[model samples]
Target chain A: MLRTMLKSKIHRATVTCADLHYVGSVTIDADLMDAADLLEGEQVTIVDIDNGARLVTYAITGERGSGVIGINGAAAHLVHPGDLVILIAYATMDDARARTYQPRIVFVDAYNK
Target chain B: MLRTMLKSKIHRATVTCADLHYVGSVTIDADLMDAADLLEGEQVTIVDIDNGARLVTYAITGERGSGVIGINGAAAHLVHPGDLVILIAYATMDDARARTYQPRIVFVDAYNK
Candidate 1:
């Protein structure tokens, strides 16, 4: 059977906005996404640290180096502006690849710079 | 710097309780924790498919046979009883360990039993 493994993570991203009415997608800074090896439209898990909210959504690459971490759509209620959150993605892999896989993790500062 | 690797995952566990009081920690059935190789006090990410709530919290070992999966503390606001969720934990390891490591994944029924 194929195994699902973590491939990318944007650690402790500070939320810049939370749109409570749009699509359930997260806008990540393009620069940050690239550093984390995350993809546009990739399924992601948002882990809120300031609050105890965990939710699933997809990624939308934003302006490069803008340091934006916008939590949009119905899932926005779980996160808010200034909240520090973690963004992670996982992918399915064959057994051979699983044995040698390494995840890309990006650590951003308070400003996500 | 050491890298963190996904070590354990409890897929599709039913939420048995949501406690808004107390510390922000998830209570897992001791049996379930053991099956997934999860540890007490280990930080985890909880993804709620039912609500899009995702949050970071630590794990608290619960009764071994109770089939309990409690979402406690501030994170309780994001999840409720009857929600289906996934629990994942990642741990830092040396480069050598990442090459040969295999994660433990446990699947449970709707009741989390």
Candidate 2:
């Protein structure tokens, strides 16, 4: 089990844009997964502060240079300027569950609005 | 000089798609920052709150498959789906100083309009 604590830091980021497709209910670039030094099938959580929504994302290494990110099984639209985004790294069990880790939260304030 | 505060639980994320391709004055992907562990003048900050404006992104990590994201110097024309990306991790003290540690930020939100 991974342990996580939620503390605040001087961290903030803004989104100019994003254009990756969803591959499943959740998906991640296999290369990005590997880049993150995470194993395949790792569970990830993404939070949107605007409307208070959370998504269960999967980790899948992506292809080098393709800029293709492994995504959820659903198709999404596109990220515009000034959007808030936060990426949280997590682990899971064999039965497909999520585990939290220390300070397992990162904040990106979205500069693209 | 890295202290962060801004807490709320059950983070949320919503985005349908994203296309990469932004190479410029502020970019990343030197093998994804050597695959995270860090090492090349690391200093990143992105903040956006509906109307907040903060842009200083310089991390040269990219070129694996070609989705492409290396923008700051100029030219950002792709990221269409959900639209929310937050990535923060910093370290600096050179001619351009920006040093903060302990906690970084990462968030992505924007289900598109």
Candidate 3:
């Protein structure tokens, strides 16, 4: 039996900026991505605290320890640099693996220092 | 080598009801889940066509021919029974598997008539 479960989540990451001119994806810090076990081009579900907005987009690698959390393109309109958001990722696996899987959670985020 | 991509979409399924007292999840017709390749307890991104509201919840089993699309619990505050919603599920795979994988899409909404 195939099951889809939350693989990782970057919680309460502050948005550094929302770049309107860039492609529609999220740019996350390399350190944070590593901490959360996320990859470039991985689908991320973004949930905004303000305005209760949510959207799905891909992840783009940004500088390590840069504290960069940029939302690009059209999604930028829904949130601002000061906004707080959560990045969630899900994975699919068989029952054998699902039974043993524990999702990775990078809480309070790792947005620089 | 890991990549997360859209696995399947149950496009424009009509909401049957939002059970407030129930656990936070969406009930999908077994028929739709089979066609859309969804699973019980699978996390699904629900995009409401009416309110532009998006929320995440697990899929629950429902009667096959009943065409139920119940948005249970708190998510109901963001969507109504009259709304049409899109059910989205993503999958994570390695590069080799992602290359040849084609996502699934099921049209012909819950109008089940």
Candidate 4:
């Protein structure tokens, strides 16, 4: 059976906004999305560093180089502006691929470097 | 095997606040908590009606008769004031108990009834 494994991670990204009125999905900067190789509508797990709250959401493209990490729709209530969150993506892979897989890891400063 | 089953539910309660600065947990009005037979610090799942956002959090005591339903800590970001949410609790029970047990259900209009 294929097992799910971590594929990529964008760590320590600051939330720029939490829009309760928006529809579902977490919006990441286009540059950051490209750096992490995260595709639009990819399922991601969001972990709130400050409160230990965790949720699953899909990623969407934000403005390129805008340093935006917005929590949109219902998930917006689970986070806040200025909060640090870890965005993680996972994939189902064969045992052989899992043996050699190295997840892409990216770290960012407060400004979303 | 023992199964996890619904224990109690507080339905359609309005969110009074989402406090990102708080440490953790969702705070419910003391009277509502009592009416639902929900103990303080009980694990509960919060479903946001407006944004389809959902999270698991613990319930804490707020002011009695205040109709307060505050989303505290990280979960505060996932919701906003005036949002509707459903609070649910579950329990592990034997098959016999599961068959006969009726989950406590409470419904509220705006202003937390």
TM-score leader: 3
Q: Taking the candidates one at a time, how many backbone clashes does each contain?
A: 9, 111, 0, 9
lDDT of every predicted structure (CA atoms) = 0.77, 0.32, 0.77, 0.77
Tell me, per candidate, how large a share of the native contacts it keeps: 0.15, 0.00, 0.17, 0.15
Question: Whole-model lDDT, candidate 2?
Answer: 0.32
Worst 10 residues of 3 chain B by lDDT: B17-26
- TM value for model 3: 0.56
Per-residue CA lDDT of model 3 for A23-42, tens digit only, reads 95899898888888999999
Residue lDDT tens for model 1, B28-101:
99999889976554557889999997776557789977889997655777778899999997766667877787
Which candidate leads in DockQ? 3
DockQ for each model: 0.12, 0.02, 0.13, 0.08
**Number of clashing pairs, model 3?**
0
TM-score of each: 0.55, 0.29, 0.56, 0.54
i-RMS for every candidate (Å) is 9.1, 13.3, 5.9, 11.3
lDDT of 2 at A100: 23
Which residues of candidate 2, in runs, are more than 4 Å off? A5-23, A49-52, A74-84, A91-113, B1-113
- Provide the clash count, candidate 4: 9
